[PDB]
Amino acid sequence: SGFRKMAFPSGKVEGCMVQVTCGTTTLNGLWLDDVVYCPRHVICTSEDMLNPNYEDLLIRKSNHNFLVQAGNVQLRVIGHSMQNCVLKLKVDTANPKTPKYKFVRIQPGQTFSVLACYNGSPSGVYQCAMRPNFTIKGSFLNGSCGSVGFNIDYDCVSFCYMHHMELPTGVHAGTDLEGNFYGPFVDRQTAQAAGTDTTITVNVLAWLYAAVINGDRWFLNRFTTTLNDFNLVAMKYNYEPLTQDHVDILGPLSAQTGIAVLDMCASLKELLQNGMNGRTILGSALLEDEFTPFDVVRQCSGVTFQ
């Protein structure tokens, strides 16, 4: 037993991380087959990024302007093109460590693992949830541009995030591997800011089920409530409305614990209304919303990857 925020093993992604240098700018790139993917911001200069014209900036580039380093081996760039906010550098060498992979965009409320990287060298790995306002609460220092987020599903790496920048509140914004931002952000210097967030209700319920599975039961009660009566309490406390689809997603956990979804909603209602009165749940004094139903089933049942 035990419940921990757990990232996927990062080896398959570590073997794809490279360093991309253009001019005086260095960031991380992702080397899969004979293409290196990185943020197009690598072609920007000190003045450029306020209203940079990336089309103009790219046409002024040559393949030799791009220095791509995979460990202590330099990769030769033979083509360059841009897809939205990502740059694609075609190289003369296919990555022999290319895992089976997909480019998938995730939904708000979903989780992924981040491999923090600097100068193409991986630094640490941690789990993030995509917030409802399309930011993530990460840990990124200067040089982390291009670090990727991913999930692993059997042996296939589904890449879903490439890091770009930090917003004024300290949260982080980036794109999918097609170069399309998550959220209303741009790869320009503006006073852009996150905008209002909400709590991911179904994940909180999933986490309460995780807690029951792990022996934390003090918050349970005999009461129930209706899905409509819960959702009226959810709005006062800035929780997302609950759907029958989310009730359906919680079915397996509800059956394994024998606690009806609607009963756990009653417990969440009292927790929101009364607080926790000095007690903790899975070592937390706060209701945690960064674990999906899948994450809970994964860790409270235990599948491994190859």
Rounded distance, CA 25 to CA 239, Å? 41
* Residues designated as active site: 41, 145
Q: Which residues pair with 66 in a beta bridge?
A: 22
Binders of a copy of itself: how many residues, by CB under 8 A? 54
Identity of the residue, 189 or 226, whose beta carbon is nearer to ligand A1ASF in the bound complex: 189
- Give kind and range of the element (H or E) at residue 228: helix 227-236
Judged by CB under 6 A, does residue 145 bind ligand A1ASF?
Answer: yes
258: left (phi over 0), alpha (psi -120 to 50) or beta: left
Task: Tell which one of 115, 131, 160, 187 touches ligand A1ASF (CB under 6 A).
Answer: 187
Show the site string, 26-55: x = touches ligand A1ASF by CB under 6 A, - = not: -x-----------x-x-------x------
Q: Which does 121 bind (CB under 5 to 8 A by kind): ligand A1ASF, a copy of itself, none?
A: a copy of itself
Judged by CB under 8 A, does residue 305 bind a copy of itself?
Answer: yes
Rounded distance, CA 63 to CA 292, Å? 43
Residue 235 buriedness (CB in 10 A; 0-12 / 13-18 / 19+): exposed
Tell the smallest beta-carbon distance from residue 21 to ligand A1ASF (Å).
Answer: 13
Show the site string, 10-29: x = touches a copy of itself by CB under 8 A, - = not: xxx-xx--------------
Judged by CB under 8 A, does residue 119 bind a copy of itself?
Answer: yes
Rounded distance, CA 292 to CA 55, Å? 39
Give the Cα-Cα-Cα angle 161, 164, 167 (nearest 5 degrees).
Answer: 115
Judged by CB under 8 A, does residue 5 bind a copy of itself?
Answer: yes
Identity of the residue, 258 or 278, whose beta carbon is nearer to a copy of itself in the bound complex: 278
Identity of the residue, 11 or 79, whose beta carbon is nearer to a copy of itself in the bound complex: 11
Tell the smallest beta-carbon distance from residue 93 to a copy of itself (Å).
Answer: 20
Identity of the residue, 10 or 158, whose beta carbon is nearer to a copy of itself in the bound complex: 10
99 closest CA partner among 7, 179, 9: 9
Where in 154-173 is the site for a copy of itself (CB under 8 A)? 166, 170-172
Q: How far is CA 77 from CA 18, 162, 196, in A?
A: 13, 21, 42
Judged by CB under 6 A, does residue 179 bind ligand A1ASF?
Answer: no
Binders of ligand A1ASF: how many residues, by CB under 6 A? 11
Rounded distance, CA 48 to CA 23, Å? 13
Q: How far is CA 155 from the centre of its chain?
A: 19
Tell the smallest beta-carbon distance from residue 85 to ligand A1ASF (Å).
Answer: 7
Q: What is the 3-state secondary structure (H, E, C) of 84-118?
A: CCEEEEEECCCCCCCCCEEECCCCCCCEEEEEEEE
Show the site string, 55-94: x = touches a copy of itself by CB under 8 A, - = not: ----------------x-----------------------
Q: What is the 3-state secondary structure (H, E, C) of 274-300?
A: HCCCCCCECCECCCCCCCCHHHHHHHC
Can you give the binding site for ligand A1ASF, defined by CB under 6 A? 27, 39, 41, 49, 145-146, 164-165, 187-189
Can you give the binding site for a copy of itself, defined by CB under 8 A? 1-12, 14-15, 71, 115-119, 121-126, 137-144, 166, 170-172, 214-215, 280, 283-286, 298-306
